[PDB]
């Protein structure tokens, strides 16, 4: 078929993202597989998605991914990525409009509350059933048979490590094997008179790991002023393979945030409570799940003992953010996060007071092209040697194009 | 050039195929590199072909292939294919319409009678000359200089193995080296009054291997009943590198099939005779060549001693098939195959009676999109321990889109 | 977005090139990593370039590369390239027309005078600033932070080797490490009354290697006759890491060529002088840089001691070329090159008189599609055993499509 013709049944979207990241560390800082260790690297992430109508009620979707690094520093003057595109997602979508339901089967980015829903979200193979028969309500069941785990490295539960006690790869949350994942979801979006309300309810059973359960709600509204409030609880109870190890513990997390917009000024205040002093627990499956609206900073929740994807210790944190937006074009702003981790100091690492300040610029050049930067300073009250404390700077420049 | 413009000299076609295969085996079953060993794997095979008019009388062709597997079972919950596209075919086509002839040079899927002509057909580099000056007759010469062997694994002659005698990789047909391939073909398609007649004659010399020669003919009829009859002989005589090894033997194969269609019922009866009791011989070069219309079942001709691409043993098999077709849309049907292999029990394995039954569903959703499934049960009268017999089940679900 | 739409902001170009090369050698020939050692190989090089307008003043560019080989001979009857596309260039271009300047940042083919500017040109990551404010003058500064070195193999300075003294990998120019590259360029194109004048001036500092400096000028003109004259000097002075090794030496090269066109006849005469009798020096960074207009033959400047990208020995060569062009369509022509290398015979290899004759056909089938061939015979007055001399033939057939 003439390509001119073939492309008419096709839709394209994607992402092009560049990153110049440099992360530094005091010798006393508790480093691990999740903190930013870039050394003036140029990083590329490109994704191109094609969706094609292939028959009545059937679309096919593919995503191509380019994930590559070029060096700057030292011997990295020869590191220059010679890489190709990889098929990252490949799946079929049956849609029946009469019953406002879709079946999506294949290798797909999961986009559940316990995984990143953006560029680097966990991908697996399985089936998703999604219903929109009710006004303002999305109902879904899903089953995953396998996970694209290698690509995710230390983003995935059970694949994070940390430094300490003369070993670079102490396992943050040992997971000897994994099963299939089964779950469901209800996700509401409603116009009250006052404004929009977004409740969410998530259940899943990950065989050999845990039964997860979560609720999250957001209210948002007008008056020229805008304010949102958002809360969430995520908990899980362990499967018996972990329960019998004795050194794991059912997860709990509480988080709340409120925020304000007026005249270009924006600000937010929020906090959260999670983990267990003595035993390993997790909040999410991959990275920080879909909880970004209930977080702040960049690095602080990657410190040892404070990671949301497996770690040991009890965490309390509060944060504030603020920024001004010149002409709806450039935003200068900052984040401040403060809190701590409690551990059993005899057996586990990362306990103590922690803080982070972040300065930010976000420049909206066009509706599709943004440039952004941040400077993050993180301080640990007690480092490798717990008597002294420890610094960790991270600087990023970023270009990001969406299409 | 604007891409909009550039694509006007371009033509696209391809394939998307999904497969959920699970193959199981009695501990007593004779396993080898060709039987189905899938363990609830999701298998993707995608091909996209672009053909561009580059100048007067010249087209260029490329094919991109994605061949990947995702796990289901056990430790395969982490196996999830992180693969890219590979250039599978790249060739030039000179066409002169005045002499109804085309010259096709490059890396190309061979599509000769001794290779699979479908998705997973053997690819090599060489030249093809094809003529359509005579009404209803296609004439061709061809020469191949190299073969895309690795991709084919055990589908290729000389690269199959089998289990037995405490060794997992007993070579089915040892081929220490290979030469170039040269051959020709005549392929007729004629409307007699009664109906269509399709004679074929194929010759080739594969240096260091064998001289192949084949004839195949099919008659089919029109209108409310329909019937086809199809026969074939494939033989080869060995090159002296194999003749002097003493343990090889010129190949012969005879096959015949007849079949009936009426009111949605269809049925077929057929049989075949091939191989040699004492010595290794082959029928085809890759997999089961283009002989699918003269076969039945799924697994039976992959049992040790019965493979069409190198094996020792003499084979006689008969088969019957049957099915009903609700609305020209869904076909439920079955295959029964029965026969045996005769060997020298002292020196070689796989001798004995063999059967296979297969249940089938074939659902034509659209002209481009088909879903199919099958359940195959294969029985070996004499297994690893030849005293007891042995089972082998295999189940497949399949989606297949052509464009 | 509908793809139909998305492709309107896009521009495509590229190259498809096929090569059947076979290079042979006397047992007495001095072989190395740069002479042609093909054995009836089919070679493919494809590049496809997409440039997209992404916002006001911003384009993005990507290049995909396919670089692959299929065998012919012996065991190479199984070598058949199973390769994919790789992202070879990925870069952003900011263009401000008000100041006739462009900033091009990313992974890009450098196209400086010291690298190949064609299909296989050295790629690195960095920034290029280019100005066209002056009539007939292009001004540029550039900085490179890393190099795509692996892809270039022995084309890159410091990665060539040679055979001799019972060792196959004697290093032609040992470079233990490399720094960043910084340079600038001025490139003129002017219509004098007589005809066009093309001066060029190139400076760069490659940290840990050398400071390079170059001038090149070309005059061309009418009188139905056409004649060009072109000269160049390339020199470099070493960085102290090489100066202190004592066995390296600042590079100098002089070259001059004049040439004639009339009635389909064309001819050229030229010569050059480079290198150092006792010590390793280089002229260019990758392959033969952009100096092809000042060279002739195919193989002779790849002989040991005569390579433009790192070698020991002093070289003088002269050459003549000539050809006739039937109908602006087919050119039959030849090259003759003659000269020598002076070395310290005690310590280094490749010294002696050398010649090359090349017969050529170049068939312009369309403005986009060319077929070409050459036969090259190279003779070394003194080979491995320096008493006897040594032959090296090289034959190429080539198809080359540009779009
Ligand atoms: C083009 C691919 C379409 C089919 C992919 C099917 C994946 C099925 O997942 C089933 C979930 O199994 C849980 C056990
Ligand atoms: C000895 O030669 C055996 C046959 O070789 C035919 C080779 O054809 C190569 C054509 O490749 C063209 C790719 O564009
Ligand atoms: Ca991730
Ligand atoms: Ca599974
Ligand atoms: Ca195959
Ligand atoms: Ca060959
Ligand atoms: Ca090169
Ligand atoms: Ca650098």
Numbering used by the authors:
A (entry chain A), B (entry chain B), C (entry chain C): 1 to 223, 226 to 405
Reproduce passages from the article.
To allay concerns about the “nativeness” of this recombinant structure arising from the difference in the lipid environment during expression, we also determined the structure of MOMP purified directly from Campylobacter and we found it to be essentially identical. In a different approach, native MOMP was purified from Campylobacter and yielded 1 mg protein per 3 g of C. jejuni cell paste. The protein purified from Campylobacter (nMOMP) was solved via molecular replacement using the recombinant MOMP structure as a search model. Beyond small differences due to crystal packing and resolution, we have not detected any meaningful structural difference between the two proteins (RMSD of 0.45 Å for 398 Cα position using SSM). In the protein purified from Campylobacter, the helix is also present and adopts the same organization but lacks the short strand seen in the overexpressed recombinant protein. The protein purified from Campylobacter was crystallized in the presence of Ca2 + ions and has an ion in an identical position but also has a second ion located outside the barrel at the interface between subunits. The recombinant structure shows a different side-chain conformation, implying that in the recombinant protein, this site does not exist. The identical trimeric arrangement is found in the protein purified from Campylobacter; in this case, the trimer is found in the crystallographic asymmetric unit. We detected no difference in structure or function between the MOMP purified from C. jejuni and the MOMP heterologously expressed in E. coli.
In contrast to E. coli, C. jejuni has only one major outer membrane protein (MOMP), which is thus far present in all isolates and is highly (but not absolutely) conserved in other Campylobacteria. MOMP is an 18-stranded antiparallel β-barrel porin with an elliptical shape common to other 18-stranded porins. Unusually for an 18-stranded β-barrel, MOMP adopts the same trimeric arrangement as seen for OmpF and OmpC, which are 16-stranded β-barrels. The most striking difference between MOMP and OmpF/OmpC from E. coli is the presence of a Ca2 +-binding site in the constriction zone of MOMP.
